[PDB]
């Protein structure tokens, strides 16, 4: 490889990978829709939100994968599907230091089953998104509003949501308190149109619909 | 160079001085007007105006690396008198 | 290539227990402690006298913004807009207008000093090196609108500081 | 084998005893729950081929260090545990059923990406 | 017997605005991530990034 | 540096160790603060033939992920061949 | 200072000689810190045992850094899959046996030995070559280039209005921070701008399992837990 | 096949209640729907792709101070982007917004041809290249 | 019926008889980089920037003046045709002034963002470059005619769909400058529609030159007033106020031009 | 399309009952918070004031959506009763400092353009 600005490519952990791909297919038909390898040597598990606990607790005690320690988990809110939320987990092999991603599909009417059975790590992760997301994890011990303001109302990175929110407080002297008003900007958060109109990389063009 | 409005104010190189009746001048009272005393309009005029002899001349800005992105300018409207769009140094052929 | 940090065992011959009941019972590792900070009490400060020496900085350091404009006294600014637009706090705000001469510049050039991040990207932003942040630090103020800068303030600071900007660019102009 | 472990170098998990004829009642048990598993499944296609050569070694083998090298699972205090877990694993799809087809395919053009 | 932390008490909407700002614009966020550790949160958005523009640094 | 020997022998006492070896605080062991003009080097992209930029493009050079199983005896395999076991470090086993 | 692309700046001149003068009087002062607290017993008494998670509880529970480490378990990002340049270099990784405190104070003091020569070895074998990638469309050009080339000019300005447009995906990408395991989630549009830019918090996980490392023990502990716990509320609050 | 109390419900889909917008921008905020049209100094086409969520425009008032246009509408920057139509109004009652939506102005065929520019008696003998 | 066949980088696409390149492969949703062709005004061919070399065809074809035939699978993506879209466009970047800060079409400029796809990432070019008299045909457009890229399209906007004849291309060789010769100011009710034909900073408006920059103008639609066409414009306002009209597209009511006054 | 997943309720008659609960709840609720808080309100006001903010979604027919929001009153009532909110949290809504807002066509339009 003469080109030393190019990332280097990894072939034989992308068909290893792969390999491992099939497999979690066959064996688990029943969830699985989709495996995805990226140019990134990276697997990508899309799987019904139905078996999050079993396929999930598959990918923790099997022999052949272990794959456990969830790194993290959360939604991507893509708006023009009609199931919104996207809750994505993360895994992180030990013994094949190898990484695994298992996203699903959810609308914000859609309980999904707590994960915290299979990794109770996942205990903080989802309340997060309960509050931050708005989709609600059904069967869950406690779900609270752990970064967001206490008595907040909305789901803050949902794409609906404007950067400034809905309110702005201050502290007021005839109610010897803080009070929360309408937000109104000192300076109104400039938007930038600027993505170029001319066809970017060609790999990635979308079909002619 | 910078006049003084009648409030009692300067005017900056934009052309900015309040108007009497306006209550923003409030901000100023019992403080100073903070004004360039500079100012670039008069301070591009004072420059010699540049005798090269040449079709097309590049101008830096002084500095080299340390100036602005080079500008190929052209003289040859001889009525006019070619200048540089970052610096504003006036370029002229003598008499062409 | 791992190395463990706690696997020690204590021996039970007669001399290791009898450094280990000396240790306690007449406490020695504390007063090894007093020992340390003793040696420490008898060495030198390294405590500066404010303001009459200050810490040493670089030359490529990022403070208190300030316009230049070139040999001619003409300004730097073309109102490109670049800095605005990188502005990762959206701290710039300004308006261009075909200036009457004809070089057409900014008209207005707002700092908000206090939504600016200090992250030196307006400075590599600019094409003409026309908005530079000065060394100085020691800028603060009592009123909310003294932090807000604006054009003839940031114009003034170029005025004021001319020999560092000059200097320090000139160190720098190479690196960069 | 030689002298028992003193510390498996994790805290938890101790280290057993009696490692060779536990990691075979375990490695006999799963084979237990992989007889009531239909064929036509892919988890038995896999796990009698994994299981029974894993079960092998322990017989072939009867020191802790020679079969701990090729069982790659690290010390066999882990293992037992591993395997414990997969012995977990194994009764959990049981009443999983994953072995039918999927539901159903996504609504519309559900995935893909971008936009 | 109790031990659930209240937290966000510093919480900053810091994914949301790195949504509408630029990756040039989005390096300094990490920086100011973790406030006891700077420059080691370059590394990780700078890694995440150039893997996905299939880019590699130079050796220096 | 200052403190004489008299002060020196306490504090090498106290501590136990040769303090005046190395010290917290810089006399004269730094670099000079202004430096001469540098030069700096070039890459592997600055010259001026054979460097068409599209053969060296990374970014269209990404082509998008690689479909492998859709819903519209094989051998068991490991999404990677188990860790080998780290050995104890040479340099200090213990500690 | 490190940008996609590599560093922005470059390395001034006779910057790595501090770094040495530095790193050769570190340990000194290292020793001094252990001389003061390794073997002081009111310390010890107060960090041993005092907060402990088991193996198989902490890597559930999504701990990583010194924990892990702290309680045996034998992973660092940095061995298992070396990122940037970490493959070419020596050096060890303080685990421990128990998993109280005490040994993730040690495994942290060991850290600190073991960063040490990790310098020693960088500023030893500093290779020369650019600070950036040679790419413009993601490394802006170099001043000079910027005032005499225009495809330089041309180049930093798209560069510095909308920037480069990252191809869609989405990668975890994962490293070894000082603290623990540092991770950003982000998928790409295809536009010059982050569709979303998931960060993984070391604290986040940590704070999360402070249940679990505070039970049993006195209330005065606590700030002891959260003190081994090393949550910065920084990235624990997001 | 998906046994967890599937029952039919045939209500629109109203997440109003929830989604956090105040009682005045649920009604108040009319909502356009249309395709960027194509920014008529660039040839490049590669934005008309996709639609969007944009909305009115409100009070844009020059503060006392430097001249920040301060507002109070929350719902200014708040632009979508929509791979197709049926979608877009979904998205559109579901938080309770009222819409306008527009049909794409795909371009009409465009003919050409350069031998035209070239006529023995056609109006399109062009005498400019 | 007698549309013929032909494919497009792999899958097939039909296609009218006599259809050019640029309108084949736009069927699939590709945009040929183009510098001098424009959709409803005549072919030019003179950017060669639409070159795309195809297999079992030794010599690339200029797209925009290539009718295509039968078996006819378009390489849009091979190498030699990325080489042609290389060296073409260093070539127009070559004698171009380093006017990017200060030219109003820096963030809405084809030719910068061509140069950001399409384009090389440093310059070959050690030499002295090329400047030209700036003229003024009128105190509502701009004329850098040094930022020039010699497209023609001001020429043929001008003698096929303003109906006059005040613009030309004078010279011979690298020089070709375009302009009046003789001084004159352009007339046209729709000589406003010049400033967005042309790809660069030739022709800016006059009003709104050095006034914003493209990526802070929020754009609206809207429609003209001024003439009961109701021309569909763009209003491109920032920080609430006004700065530019700009012509939607309509096609059968107003296409992409709009009148002087109403710009 | 029509078939859902109920999120935890089914039929209306036992969502609403939830609601019943929940609104049970609130109502022994309501004077505890007052006493505690140290606050500066009679209990009767906060009861309407519980009513009326069950009356601005009284209006929706999805049996999800209101068990979401039963759950999200849960997700309020806990706060109060767990001190965890201050007095600024729960006379917020005692919505006390903000000017009152035109109402008729023509306060508005004598205030300002905004519609
Ligand atoms: C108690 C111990 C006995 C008295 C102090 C002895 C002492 O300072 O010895 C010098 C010296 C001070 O410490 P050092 O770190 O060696 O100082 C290095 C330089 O002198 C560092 O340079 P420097 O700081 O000595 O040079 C300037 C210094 C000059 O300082 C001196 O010359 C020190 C003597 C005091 C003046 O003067 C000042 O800084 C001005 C401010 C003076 C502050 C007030 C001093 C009050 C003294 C006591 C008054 C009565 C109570 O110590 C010794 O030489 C040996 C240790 C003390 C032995 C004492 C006899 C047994
Ligand atoms: C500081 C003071 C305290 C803190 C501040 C005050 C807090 C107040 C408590 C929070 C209340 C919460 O917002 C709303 C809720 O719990 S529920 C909404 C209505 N519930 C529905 O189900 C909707 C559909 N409506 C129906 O189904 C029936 O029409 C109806 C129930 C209206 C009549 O009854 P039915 O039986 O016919
Ligand atoms: S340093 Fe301040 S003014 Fe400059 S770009 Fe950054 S935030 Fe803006
Ligand atoms: S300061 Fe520099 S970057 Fe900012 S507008 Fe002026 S010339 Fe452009
Ligand atoms: S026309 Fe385009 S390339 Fe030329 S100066 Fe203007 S913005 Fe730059
Ligand atoms: S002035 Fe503009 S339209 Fe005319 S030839 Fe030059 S670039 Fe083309
Ligand atoms: S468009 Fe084909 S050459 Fe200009
Ligand atoms: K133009
Ligand atoms: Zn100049």
Request: overall charge neutral.
């Amino acid at each position: 490889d003469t080109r030393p600005t190019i990332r280097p490519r990894n072939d034989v952990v992308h068909k290893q990978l792969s390999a491992f791909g099939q497999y979690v297919a066959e064996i688990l038909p029943k969830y699985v829709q989709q495996v995805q390898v990226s140019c990134f040597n990276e697997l990508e598990i899309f799987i019904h939100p139905d078996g999050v606990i079993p396929v999930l607790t598959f990918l923790r005690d099997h022999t052949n994968a272990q794959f456990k320690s969830l790194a993290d988990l959360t939604a991507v809110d893509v708006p023009t599907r009609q199931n919104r939320f996207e809750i994505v987990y993360n895994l992180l092999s030990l013994r094949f230091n190898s990484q695994i991603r298992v996203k699903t599909y959810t609308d914000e009417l859609t309980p999904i089953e707590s994960s915290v059975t299979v990794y109770k790590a996942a205990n903080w992760y989802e309340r997060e998104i309960w509050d931050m997301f708005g989709v609600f994890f059904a069967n869950h011990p406690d779900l609270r509003r752990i970064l967001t303001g206490y008595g907040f109302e909305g789901h803050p990175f949902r794409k609906d949501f404007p950067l400034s929110g809905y309110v702005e407080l201050r502290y007021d002297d005839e109610v010897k308190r803080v009070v929360a008003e309408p937000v109104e900007l000192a300076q109104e958060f400039r938007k930038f149109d600027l993505n170029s109109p001319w066809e970017a990389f060609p790999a990635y063009r979308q079909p002619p619909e | 160079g910078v006049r003084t409005s009648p409030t009692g104010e300067k005017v900056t190189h934009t052309g900015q001085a309040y108007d009497d009746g306006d209550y923003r001048r409030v901000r100023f009272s019992d403080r100073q007007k903070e004004v360039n005393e500079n100012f670039a309009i008069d301070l591009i005029a004072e420059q010699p105006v540049s005798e090269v002899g040449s079709r097309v001349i590049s101008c830096d800005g002084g500095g080299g690396a340390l100036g602005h992105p080079r500008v190929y300018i052209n003289l040859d409207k001889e009525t006019k008198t070619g200048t540089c769009g970052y610096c504003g140094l006036q370029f002229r052929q003598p008499h062409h | 290539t791992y190395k463990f940090v706690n696997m020690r065992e204590p021996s039970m011959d007669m001399k290791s227990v009898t450094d280990r009941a000396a240790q306690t019972l007449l406490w020695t590792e504390l007063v090894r402690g007093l020992g340390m900070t003793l040696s420490y009490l008898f060495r030198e400060p390294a405590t500066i006298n404010y303001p009459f020496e200050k810490g040493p900085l670089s030359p490529r350091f990022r403070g208190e913004h300030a316009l230049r404009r070139y040999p001619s006294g003409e300004e730097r600014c073309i109102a490109c807009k670049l800095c605005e637009a990188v502005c990762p706090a959206q701290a710039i705000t300004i308006e261009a207008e075909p200036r009457a001469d004809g070089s057409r510049r900014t008209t207005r050039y707002d700092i908000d000093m206090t939504k600016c991040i200090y992250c030196g990207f307006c400075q590599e932003a600019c094409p003409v090196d026309a908005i530079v942040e000065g060394p100085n630090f020691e800028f603060s103020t009592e009123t909310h609108e003294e932090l807000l800068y604006n054009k003839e303030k940031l114009l003034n600071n170029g005025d004021k500081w001319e020999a560092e900007i000059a200097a320090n660019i000139q160190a720098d102009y190479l690196y960069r | 084998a030689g002298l028992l472990k003193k510390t498996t170098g994790l805290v938890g998990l101790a280290v057993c005893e009696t490692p060779h004829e536990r990691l075979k009642i375990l490695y006999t048990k799963i084979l237990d729950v992989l007889g009531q598993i239909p064929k036509n499944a892919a988890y038995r296609k896999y796990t009698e081929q994994i299981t029974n050569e894993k079960l092998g070694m322990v017989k072939a083998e009867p020191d802790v260090k020679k079969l701990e090298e090729q069982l790659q699972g690290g010390q066999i205090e882990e293992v037992i545990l591993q395997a414990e877990n997969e012995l977990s694993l194994a009764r959990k799809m049981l009443r999983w059923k994953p072995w039918e087809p999927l539901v159903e395919e996504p609504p519309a053009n559900q995935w893909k990406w971008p936009i | 017997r109790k031990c659930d932390p209240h937290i966000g008490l510093l919480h900053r909407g810091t994914e949301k605005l790195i949504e509408y700002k630029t990756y040039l614009q989005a390096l300094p966020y990490f920086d100011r991530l973790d406030y006891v550790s700077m420059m080691c949160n370059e590394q990780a958005y700078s890694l995440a990034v150039e893997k996905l523009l299939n880019i590699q640094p130079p050796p220096r | 540096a200052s403190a004489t020997r008299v002060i020196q022998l306490l504090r090498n006492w106290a501590s136990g160790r040769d303090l005046q070896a190395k010290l917290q605080l810089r006399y004269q062991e730094i670099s000079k603060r202004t430096q001469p003009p540098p030069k700096l080097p070039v890459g592997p992209s600055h010259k001026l033939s054979n460097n068409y930029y599209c053969t060296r493009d990374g970014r269209r050079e990404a082509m998008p992920p690689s479909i492998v199983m859709s819903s519209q005896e094989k051998k068991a395999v490991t999404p990677a061949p188990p860790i080998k076991r780290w050995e104890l470090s040479k340099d200090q086993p213990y500690l | 200072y490190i940008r996609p692309g590599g560093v922005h700046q470059d390395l001034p001149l006779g910057l790595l000689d501090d770094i040495y003068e530095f790193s050769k009087n570190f340990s000194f002062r290292i020793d001094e810190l252990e001389e003061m607290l390794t073997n002081n017993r009111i310390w010890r008494n107060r960090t041993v045992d005092i907060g402990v998670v088991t193996a198989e509880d902490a890597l559930n529970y999504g701990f990583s850094g010194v924990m892990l480490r702290g309680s045996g378990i034998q992973w660092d990002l940095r061995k298992t899959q070396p990122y940037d340049v970490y493959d070419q270099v020596e050096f060890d990784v303080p685990i421990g046996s128990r998993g109280d405190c005490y040994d993730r104070y040690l495994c942290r003091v060991e850290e600190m030995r073991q960063s040490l020569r990790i310098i020693s070895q960088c500023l030893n074998k500093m290779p020369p070559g650019e600070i950036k990638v040679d790419d413009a469309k993601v490394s802006p050009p170099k001043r000079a280039e910027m005032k005499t080339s225009m495809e330089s000019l041309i180049h930093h300005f798209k560069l510095y209005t909308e920037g480069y447009q990252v191809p869609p995906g989405a990668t975890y990408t994962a490293i070894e921070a000082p603290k623990g395991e540092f991770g950003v989630y982000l998928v790409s549009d295809g536009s010059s701008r982050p569709y979303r830019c998931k960060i993984k918090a070391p604290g986040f996980a940590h704070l999360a399992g402070l249940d679990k490392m505070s039970k049993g023990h006195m209330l005065a502990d606590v700030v002891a837990i959260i003190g081994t716990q090393d949550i910065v509320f920084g990235e624990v609050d997001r | 096949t998906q046994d967890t109390q599937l029952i039919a419900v045939d209500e629109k889909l109203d997440i109003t209640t929830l989604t956090g917008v105040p009682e005045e921008h649920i009604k108040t905020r009319k909502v356009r729907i249309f395709v960027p049209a194509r920014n008529n100094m660039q040839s490049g086409v590669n934005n008309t792709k996709k639609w969007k969520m944009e909305f009115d425009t409100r009070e844009r008032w020059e503060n006392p101070l430097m001249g920040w246009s301060s507002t109070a509408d929350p719902l200014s920057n708040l632009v979508l982007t929509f791979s197709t139509k049926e979608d877009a109004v979904a998205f559109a009652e579901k938080n309770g917004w009222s819409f306008d939506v527009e049909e794409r102005k795909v371009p009409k065929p465009k003919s050409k041809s350069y031998g035209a520019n070239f006529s023995w008696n056609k109006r399109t003998r062009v005498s400019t290249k | 019926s007698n549309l013929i066949e032909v494919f497009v980088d792999g899958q097939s696409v039909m296609v009218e008889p006599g259809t050019t390149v640029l309108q084949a492969c736009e069927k699939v949703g590709m945009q040929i980089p183009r510098f001098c062709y424009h959709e409803r005004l005549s072919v030019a061919g003179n950017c060669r920037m639409c070159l795309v070399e195809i297999e079992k065809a030794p010599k690339v074809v200029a797209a925009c003046a290539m009718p295509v035939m039968k078996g006819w699978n378009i390489l849009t993506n091979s190498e030699k045709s990325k080489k042609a879209r290389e060296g073409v466009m260093e070539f127009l970047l070559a004698n171009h002034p380093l006017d990017c800060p200060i030219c109003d079409q820096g963030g809405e400029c084809d030719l910068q963002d061509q140069s950001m796809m399409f384009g090389s990432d440093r310059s070959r070019f050690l030499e002295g470059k090329r400047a030209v008299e700036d003229k003024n045909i009128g105190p509502l457009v701009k004329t850098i005619m040094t930022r020039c890229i010699q497209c023609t399209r001001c020429i043929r906007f001008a003698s096929e769909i303003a109906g006059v004849d005040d613009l030309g291309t004078t010279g011979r060789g690298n020089d070709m400058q375009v302009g009046t010769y003789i001084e004159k100011m352009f007339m046209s009710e729709l000589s406003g529609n010049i400033i967005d034909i042309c790809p660069v900073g030739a022709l800016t408006s006059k009003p709104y030159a050095f006034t914003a920059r493209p990526w802070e103008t929020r754009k609206t639609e809207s429609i003209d007033v001024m003439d009961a066409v109701g021309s569909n414009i763009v209003v491109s306002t920032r920080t609430g106020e006004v700065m530019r009209i700009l012509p939607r597209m309509h096609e059968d009511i107003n296409e992409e031009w709009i009148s002087d006054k109403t710009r | 399309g029509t078939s859902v997943k109920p999120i935890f309720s089914r039929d209306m008659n036992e969502a609403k009952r939830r609601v019943r609960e929940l609104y049970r709840a609130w109502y022994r609720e309501v004077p505890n918070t007052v006493h505690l808080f140290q606050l500066d309100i009679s209990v009767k006001q906060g009861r309407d004031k519980v009513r009326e903010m069950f009356m601005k979604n009284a209006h929706v027919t999805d049996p999800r959506v209101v068990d979401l929001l039963v759950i999200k009153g849960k997700m309020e009532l806990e706060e109060t009763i767990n001190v965890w909110k201050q007095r600024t949290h729960i006379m917020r809504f005692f919505h006390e400092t903000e000017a009152p807002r035109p109402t008729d066509f023509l306060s508005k339009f004598y205030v300002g353009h905004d519609p």
